[PDB]
Design a protein around this nucleic acid. Structure first.
Ligand SMILES: [Zn+2]
Ligand SMILES: [Zn+2]
Ligand SMILES: [Zn+2]
Ligand SMILES: [Zn+2]
Ligand SMILES: [Zn+2]
Lengths: 321, 20, 182, 368, 506
DNA sequence: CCCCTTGGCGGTTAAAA
DNA sequence: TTTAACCGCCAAGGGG
């Protein structure tokens, strides 16, 4: 056997920058200098153990979702589509292996004789006028459009001034979000952050930093909290916005049965209303302390106190009689 | 705050009567 | 053209958007009240109360056209990106039996409700007249009022964690990965 | 105690490298082996080589599709695999290298064989540092892990024992092993981890378990830079109450080097003796144990710590001088057997730990 | 009583926006919506800070499955996944319904890692290069062993050899040569031996380089606070921070006389600080020739008067109060800081010295080949020479400027094991102490206040008017805006108490 | 040998976007 | 709109 001499392209590169066969790299020399037997007894003292009980077994975005990823591009029309963002959804494993044209290109080749197109639609219409014809135009035309991801029509969203579209199109609402002694200082009043739970700031000292405590300052009502006062391990920086235990649930499971609080609507469309009984008036949790379905009651605060008391009385009358 | 006082006095007398 | 969707249905649509896109949930299919069933119930309940003949045949024509349009446009403009993989699963499951796909018997009451939100944006790019579009808008408005009538049974609040029959089901890491990554 | 200690080591678990700058190298295991062989510990332990696992045993917990994918996936045929890569999370974070299936099979076989030896009664201490991939969950690679050999270990131990206790002291929460037994009341998991915006993301305090396994899962969240005098003080009472009240038959302990001081990814400030105190206290109960080795990405520290642990298991305290292993140059300026803590500030106040103990003990008061 | 709970809650919460939420929660309960347990929890988080009103609420109302926040639940459809080996018990104990998938528990945002200094990065790079060399060499060694066992047989564990042969024959001819071997063994064996020899030579040279690099960086890597220190001390050892601390303690105590407290157990530390201060004063070219002696006498008089230690031994080397302005308070705080740091250093000194003098060395190869001979050639390795006194001597050296900060810090780190990082600013803190003494001297009002303090202190037998007339005179010397500090000390037990009477004298 | 000379670093702020 | 010039403040060392 006479194989080719050697591998002349032997040493290419390594992690050290050098080809692993050259060594010190003198520049690094000057940068990084100043000026009971062995293991070989493992081959014999290893016994193969097999006693297991189971031993015997063009564009960079998709033309439908406007996002990057796997692309099945076209040639007749410079567009790009995801394999899933396509009607019908086609599997990347079994590629068509051929000329793939979008629906618009298919129509423009097969149908679009610039004048005769009317005839075509006409024909469809006259085979659908006797049958359902209100939808005839849409039924004919939606065979000429490309598939799209479904987004709300830009006016359902605006009915609520507490929602917004994220980067790619996601949902986003009002909850999306060594020794530091300055965190206990407001910087606008010169006062400390008196925590609700403990009524102290616990600044500690620079000489004794092991007596200070981390503080939170909730992101909704701006009240300060210790990380230890409400059991919690760390700050909230990346995820949602922290909310202290001094807020209403806005979601209740009573044994099941669910209750939810309504959403925020633009003040022009908000129908505020006030009752007249002032003692017993069954409202939802949509109240305000001082299309006609989202009426928020103005609850007349002194009523709430009353709304409490007899209920407890009733809760007593259940178990006392 | 007097209506609450009178109503609760009456209701407590009624409850005592019902629990004599 | 102006369309007056009631506030409860707008809230339901916003909730659907939030559930699908934020919480990664998808619909539980086949729904126990599908598009075909709700449309048939609407037609049967309204026709027995209206006596005029023309307004009774036009209602049936509108319902049939709505069914056909839903079928023809669901796989085009009614699904988010996350829900297209479940659509593919359904399509291939049907494709094993040489059967066709009938979304009106699978989807229900929440993809039809989201179907009538782009009608202003669908009619606009057409060549229809004016007094015909007005009739379509009026019919959609009566249908929306009827849907708002029976809203305490088509959209009930049940959690996927606590109920298996709830309107939405949680997804897995693999399904979400293939959907939003492939 | 004077336990009969087995020890599993395959001479090929060190020849399987991840990517270039990838922080996970199993070379450390082989390094640890030298620290165990030059210290003369081979005269006190029965070294074995577990037979590599097969697909029919991995599929006990994992799925057929995932295992079939692992056994065929290769850097060479990677561009023909485009669906299973994104589906199974076998992309960049958990890279595909040349010896993936062999490494996973060795890791699984070691744990299963140690569990079997515990079952029959040959040894009452099993040590397999190759296994301990406590992250993979039945369908997906997650955090450098591909096969949850630990869960195979508890399955094999369950085939004999009524109850098993799985203690995890890796800095990352044991999501994979807590998920597989979230519902059952046989296996009780107890994980000490760092909770914040850290990699596992799970392990909240109120994760007591769902369904039939309610109150049978304990999570201890800890902050940055905990040290020996604090980690011991939080470790001992909880394990004391668990073993007094839950009363396991066997016990698995995950000894990860990620909690060591100066680790590439961790944020704790445990010394070698602080880590070894946990193993001392676990062995102080007498029940059979299967110690494994999970994370740890500074080899000069994890090798020393694992050697000290295996020495302590054999009831000996090793010399603080190195016996001139093959990999001498790795072991720092003084060439001792010790991990030195840093002066980083401990953010774990006693009040937070006291509240954590109150919650955990209140949860456990109903587990006779 | 029960008809006044709402007023009590209104005065307790003390806020209107939070009282709105409290009323909303009460209404939520009142409409049958909220249960009794969550109401109790919310009133525990609102009024639970009190042990009296909350208990009244509890007994008046007659109070007397739970999922976690990190696990979803899949439908039964995603239960049927084929496991070709799952036994009945495996189906019994395992779980396929609830899944966590951290990305869901991370709110799809991401994870925050830990911060690592550049020295740790250098160590990581060195470790990576070491690993690459060792991994390639060991793979080649194992394949060489297998090839030797093959060739000695033919003279008359599935991917290692293929991978290593591919690496050696990287010209893409390896695929053919592997199968040619399967059907040429000696030549590839000898080529592997040659490659191993060159790799080991390169590894020896790189071991030299890595040892040299690591010996100067390892100890720096373990210094987390020490590297940021001497920069944070600059902006954290001012007067405003000390006033902020004392005012915060006062504020915390005002919701329930001795706000601060210090204890001075040791004595010779005063002499150590005096020696450092006199050394700095002698060296510094920033004052006048008599000013140096004036500062020395001021420090000696203040020490020997406040603590009454000795008026003469300082040159051989009934509770008293003290009212002060900001200058005297900051001077005293600087003194307390220096004393605290030196006391912390001296407390562990016996164990530190015992550890240093017993530092044995390894003799297998350490003393044979490679040693760290950088801190020993300059005598900065604490060989004998009790550590506290050596630290004081090196502090005097660095104050005198004949020792760059690098080697002082390195010696301190290697001697005290990063437990003495707070001595990196001994020179600057002594300079600040001297400057504060000078400013205390060159201020007329401050001089008068110290004159009054001297009179009161040396009196040692005062009248019932002691506090009041003294305070009135000092306040007359003071303005109507600056704060007031009552610093007291009792000779019985060496305990100094600080009270923050900012404007309470009026 | 001793001084530029380098090397970094922090609060202000004005200048390019 | 913010972020890098820009002047003060410090300390190591290359070389003329
Ligand atoms: Zn797409
Ligand atoms: Zn096209
Ligand atoms: Zn607090
Ligand atoms: Zn709040
Ligand atoms: Zn880990």
């Amino acid at each position: 056997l006479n194989e080719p001499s050697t591998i002349s392209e032997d040493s290419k590169v390594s992690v050290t920058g050098l080809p692993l066969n050259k060594g010190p790299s003198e520049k690094i020399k000057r940068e990084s200098l100043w000026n009971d037997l062995k293991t070989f007894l493992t081959e014999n003292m290893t016994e193969e153990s097999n006693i297991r009980s189971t031993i015997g077994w063009n564009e960079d975005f998709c033309s439908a979702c406007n996002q990057s990823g796997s692309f099945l591009c076209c040639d007749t029309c410079p567009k790009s589509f995801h394999f899933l963002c396509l009607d019908p959804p086609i599997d990347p494993n079994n590629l068509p292996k051929g000329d793939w044209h979008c629906n618009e290109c298919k129509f423009k080749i097969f149908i679009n004789n610039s004048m005769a197109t009317l005839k075509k639609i006409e024909s469809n219409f006259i085979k659908q006028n006797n049958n359902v014809k209100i939808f005839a135009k849409l039924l004919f035309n939606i065979d000429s459009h490309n598939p799209k991801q479904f987004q709300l029509p830009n006016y359902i969203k605006e009915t609520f001034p507490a929602v917004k579209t994220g980067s790619r199109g996601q949902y986003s609402d009002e909850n999306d979000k060594s020794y530091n002694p300055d965190t206990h200082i407001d910087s606008n009043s010169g006062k400390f952050l008196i925590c609700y739970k403990c009524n102290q700031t616990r600044l500690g000292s620079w000489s004794h930093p092991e007596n200070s405590r981390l503080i939170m300052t909730c992101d909704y009502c701006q009240t300060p909290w210790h990380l230890d006062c409400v059991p919690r391990a760390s700050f909230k920086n990346l995820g949602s916005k922290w909310k202290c235990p001094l807020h209403s649930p806005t979601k209740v499971y009573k044994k099941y049965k669910v209750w939810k609080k309504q959403r925020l609507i633009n003040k022009k469309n908000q129908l505020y209303y006030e009752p007249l009984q002032k003692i017993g008036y069954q409202n939802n949790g949509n109240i305000q302390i001082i299309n006609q379905d989202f009426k928020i009651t103005q609850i007349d605060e002194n009523s709430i106190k009353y709304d409490f008391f007899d209920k407890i009385y009733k809760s007593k009358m259940v178990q006392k009689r | 705050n007097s209506i609450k006082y009178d109503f609760f006095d009456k209701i407590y007398k009624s409850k005592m009567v019902q629990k004599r | 053209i102006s369309l007056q969707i009631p506030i409860k249905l707008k809230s339901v649509l916003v909730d659907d958007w939030e559930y699908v896109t934020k919480d990664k949930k998808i619909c539980r299919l086949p729904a126990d009240v599908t598009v075909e069933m709700v449309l048939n119930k609407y037609e049967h309940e309204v026709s027995q109360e209206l006596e005029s003949p023309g307004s009774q045949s036009q209602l049936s024509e509108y319902c049939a056209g709505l069914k056909l349009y839903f079928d023809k446009c669901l796989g085009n403009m009614l699904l988010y990106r996350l829900e297209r993989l479940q659509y593919d699963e359904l399509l291939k499951k049907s494709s094993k039996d040489q059967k066709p796909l009938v979304p009106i018997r699978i989807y229900g009451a929440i993809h039809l409700l989201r179907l009538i939100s782009v009608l202003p944006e669908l009619i606009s790019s057409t060549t229809m007249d004016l007094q015909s579009c007005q009739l379509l808008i009026k019919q959609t408005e009566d249908f929306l009022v009827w849907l708002l009538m029976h809203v305490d049974e088509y959209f009930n609040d049940k959690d996927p964690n606590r109920s298996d029959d709830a309107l939405y089901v949680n997804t897995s890491s693999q399904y979400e990965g293939v959907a939003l990554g492939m | 105690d004077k336990r009969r200690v087995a020890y599993f080591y395959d001479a090929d678990v060190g020849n399987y490298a991840y990517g270039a700058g990838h922080p996970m190298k199993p070379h450390r295991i082989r390094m640890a082996h030298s620290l165990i062989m030059n210290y003369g510990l081979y005269k006190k332990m029965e070294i074995y080589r577990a037979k590599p696992a097969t697909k029919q045993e991995m599929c006990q917990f994992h799925t057929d599709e995932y295992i079939d994918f692992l056994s065929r996936v290769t850097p060479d045929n990677l561009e023909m695999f485009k669906r299973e890569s994104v589906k199974f999370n076998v992309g960049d974070d958990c890279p595909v290298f040349d010896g993936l299936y062999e490494y996973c099979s060795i890791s699984g076989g070691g744990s299963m064989e140690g569990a079997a030896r515990l079952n029959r009664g040959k040894c009452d201490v099993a040590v397999n540092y190759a296994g301990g991939l406590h992250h993979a969950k039945k369908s997906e690679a997650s955090g450098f892990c591909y096969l949850n050999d630990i869960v195979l270990g508890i399955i094999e131990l369950l085939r004999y024992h009524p109850r098993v206790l799985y203690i995890d002291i890796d800095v990352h929460h044991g999501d994979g092993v807590e998920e597989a037994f979230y519902t059952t009341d046989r296996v009780m998991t107890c994980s000490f981890h760092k909770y914040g915006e850290f990699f596992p993301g799970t392990g909240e305090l109120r994760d007591i378990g769902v369904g039939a396994g309610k109150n049978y899962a304990v999570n201890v969240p800890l902050r940055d830079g905990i040290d020996d005098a604090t980690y011991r003080s939080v470790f001992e009472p909880v394990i004391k109450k668990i073993m007094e009240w839950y009363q396991p038959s066997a016990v698995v302990l995950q000894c990860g080097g990620d909690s060591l001081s100066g680790d590439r990814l961790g944020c704790f400030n445990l010394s070698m003796e602080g880590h070894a105190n946990c193993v001392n206290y676990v062995k102080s109960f007498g029940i059979p144990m299967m110690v494994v080795g999970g994370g740890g990405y500074t080899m000069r520290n994890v090798a020393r710590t694992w050697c000290f642990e295996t020495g302590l298991l054999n009831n000996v305290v090793l010399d603080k001088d190195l016996p001139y292993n093959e990999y001498y140059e790795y072991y720092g300026p003084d060439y001792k057997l010790s991990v030195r803590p840093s002066n980083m500030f401990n953010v774990n106040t006693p009040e937070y730990l006291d509240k954590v103990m109150t919650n955990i003990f209140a949860n456990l008061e109903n587990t006779k | 009583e029960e008809v006044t709970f709402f007023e009590k809650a209104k005065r307790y919460i003390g806020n209107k926006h939070l009282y709105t939420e409290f009323l909303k929660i009460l209404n939520l309960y009142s409409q049958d919506i909220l249960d009794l347990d969550d109401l109790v929890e919310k009133v525990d988080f609102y009024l639970g800070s009190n042990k009296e009103l909350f208990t009244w609420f509890k007994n008046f109302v007659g109070y007397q499955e739970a999922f976690g926040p990190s696990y979803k639940r899949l439908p039964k459809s995603d239960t049927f996944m084929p496991c070709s080996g799952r036994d009945d018990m495996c189906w019994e104990v395992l779980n396929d319904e609830w899944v966590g998938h951290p990305v869901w528990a991370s709110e799809d945002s991401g994870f925050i890692a830990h911060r690592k200094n550049q020295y740790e990065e250098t160590l990581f790079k060195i470790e990576e290069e070491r690993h690459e060399y060792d991994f390639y060499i060991e793979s080649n060694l194992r394949t060489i062993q297998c090839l030797e066992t093959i060739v000695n047989k033919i003279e008359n564990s599935m991917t290692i050899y293929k991978k290593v042969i591919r690496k050696v024959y990287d010209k893409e001819r390896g695929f053919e040569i592997i199968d040619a071997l399967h059907e040429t063994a000696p030549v590839v064996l000898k080529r592997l031996k040659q490659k191993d020899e060159e790799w080991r030579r390169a590894q020896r040279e790189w071991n030299k380089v890595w040892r040299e690099l690591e010996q100067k960086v390892f100890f720096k890597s373990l210094d987390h606070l020490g590297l940021t220190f001497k920069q944070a001390d600059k902006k954290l050892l001012t007067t405003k921070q000390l006033i902020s601390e004392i005012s915060s303690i006062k504020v915390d105590q005002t919701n329930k006389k001795s706000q601060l407290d210090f204890d001075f157990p040791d004595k010779n530390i005063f002499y150590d600080i005096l020696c450092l201060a006199d050394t700095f004063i002698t060296h510094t070219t920033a004052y006048s020739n008599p000013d140096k002696e004036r500062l020395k006498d001021l420090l000696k008089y203040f020490i020997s008067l406040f603590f009454s230690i000795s008026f003469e031994k300082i040159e051989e080397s009934s509770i008293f109060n003290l009212f002060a302005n900001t200058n005297i308070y900051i001077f005293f705080r600087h003194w307390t800081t220096i004393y605290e740091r030196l006391l912390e250093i001296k407390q562990m000194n016996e164990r530190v010295t015992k550890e240093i003098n017993t530092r044995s060395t390894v003799t297998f190869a350490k003393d044979l080949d490679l040693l760290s001979s950088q801190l020993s050639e300059m005598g900065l390795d604490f060989v004998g020479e009790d550590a506290y006194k050596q630290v004081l001597r090196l502090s005097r050296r660095l104050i005198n400027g004949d020792l760059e900060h690098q080697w002082f810090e390195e010696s301190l780190r290697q001697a005290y094991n990063n437990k003495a990082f707070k001595l990196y600013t001994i020179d600057k803190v002594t300079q600040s102490l001297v400057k504060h003494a000078h400013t205390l001297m060159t201020d007329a009002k401050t001089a008068e206040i110290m004159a009054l303090f001297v009179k009161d202190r040396n009196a040692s037998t005062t009248s019932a008017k002691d506090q009041i007339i003294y305070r009135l005179q000092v306040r007359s010397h003071m303005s109507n805006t600056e704060n007031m500090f009552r610093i007291e000390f009792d000779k019985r037990t060496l305990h100094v108490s600080i009270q923050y009477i900012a404007l309470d004298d009026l």
